[PDB]
Design a protein around this ligand. Sequence first.
Ligand SMILES: O=c1ccn([C@@H]2O[C@H](COP(=O)(O)OP(=O)(O)O[C@H]3O[C@H](CO)[C@@H](O)[C@H](O)[C@H]3O)[C@@H](O)[C@H]2O)c(=O)[nH]1
Ligand SMILES: [Mg+2]
Length: 459
Amino acid sequence: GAMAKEWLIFALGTNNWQGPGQFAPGSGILHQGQHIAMNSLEKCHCYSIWPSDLQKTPTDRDDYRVYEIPHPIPICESKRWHSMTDEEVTSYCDNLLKECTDFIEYIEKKHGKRINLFLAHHCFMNPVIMSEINERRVAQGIPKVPLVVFAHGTALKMYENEINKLPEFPMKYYDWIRGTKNIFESTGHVSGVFAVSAPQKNSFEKLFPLFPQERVAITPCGYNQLVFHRIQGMTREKAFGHMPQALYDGFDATQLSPVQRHVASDQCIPDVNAYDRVVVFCGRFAHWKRIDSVLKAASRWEKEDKRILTLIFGAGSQETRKLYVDMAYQTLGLKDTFFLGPQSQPDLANVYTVADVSVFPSHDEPFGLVFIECMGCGTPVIGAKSGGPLDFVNDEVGALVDEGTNDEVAERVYAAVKQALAEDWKKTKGAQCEQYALKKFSLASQAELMLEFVESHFT
Ligand SMILES: O=c1ccn([C@@H]2O[C@H](COP(=O)(O)OP(=O)(O)O[C@H]3O[C@H](CO)[C@@H](O)[C@H](O)[C@H]3O)[C@@H](O)[C@H]2O)c(=O)[nH]1
Ligand SMILES: [Mg+2]
């Protein structure tokens, strides 16, 4: 070959990117990372479209557009796809198709060159739309463009709910996407599927058994090292000293003991420099993140009076916030553990930078972006021996505790933190953490591999 492959990519997302007034789910963070990654590669341009009922399509950038919609993004499980009416499902898909074809028109005029990769997120309406966009192009005498799908799992779970005839999931999509659209019944529409985790690859392969397993693979995932790096001059007071406690609406401070009076809604953490060491969790408040294992480990170490400060970052519904706030303060008597809410990526880099250790004791973490972000800031990590972290957490960058009940994990997390603090892992592994993360997991290295994989195995 005389020249390197030039890529011109169009990427259709399911969720919003992270911006003002709207935090993004894992899926939307990944899409945004990938967009960043691919516009870094030498012979490569990526254009993206994604939906939001709040964020507005930009005025001074052309590299992405927002599909501005009148109601919250439909969820597989505010309103659900199965709750929508046909006319509403139809016009959501039809209007999005139109905005895609118009963006594609603009892109191909700007470059005097045809798009040569479609990327579609989730195994539902986005590959249906890009599949129809391809058929329309062939009919017009335009070359078709390989289509690659990112299985994140939410659409696959919805299909299983239809198959097992759960009540609020009458069969409406799975049989249609296999029997009428035939999206995954061959390689005629979709060239390859990237799954974020092994259970999603397994679930995809069971739900779409006519799709060649050779064309199914696990997504290489990167982190944004432009944002997640050791932050020069950072301080505890700058990093989290001005973040207010984020509890839940209607939280009653009178139900708390006197030694807990520092716990207060919308108040900052008092005198952050008095604490000896800082332990950080970050994650959405899902049950499999095992936040309760973090809170139980802290119940033990807070009894030892070593001034260990524990920070819980991440979002939850009012229900899950009440569960873990009340668990922390009424059930376990914590007083040096605080909830600080969801935060921007730059704010988290500052926190990781000043943390002694992070703990993410997930049960079957799909990949574990939080792990790589934290290490990329020069901080060690403690997780569990399940899911994605098994593949990349070793003893030089932190530790994975043995799987078990939530109570067993809690005791093992307590032992791991006590040992990280005693041996000052921050000092002895910190540098290795940033170098490991930077070299194996940067956004641009991982996208490069991904595209080489598309060319080697998805033709
Ligand atoms: O307050 C927060 C919390 C999270 N994040 C970002 O969101 C990412 C993921 O956080 P997480 O709580 O794990 O959300 P999930 O939706 O559960 O992430 C899913 O999606 C990721 C990318 O596909 C995978 O790495 C995860 O394992 C998978 O669970 C973080 O790494 C951060 O980049 C923020 O920016 N602010
Ligand atoms: Mg999916």
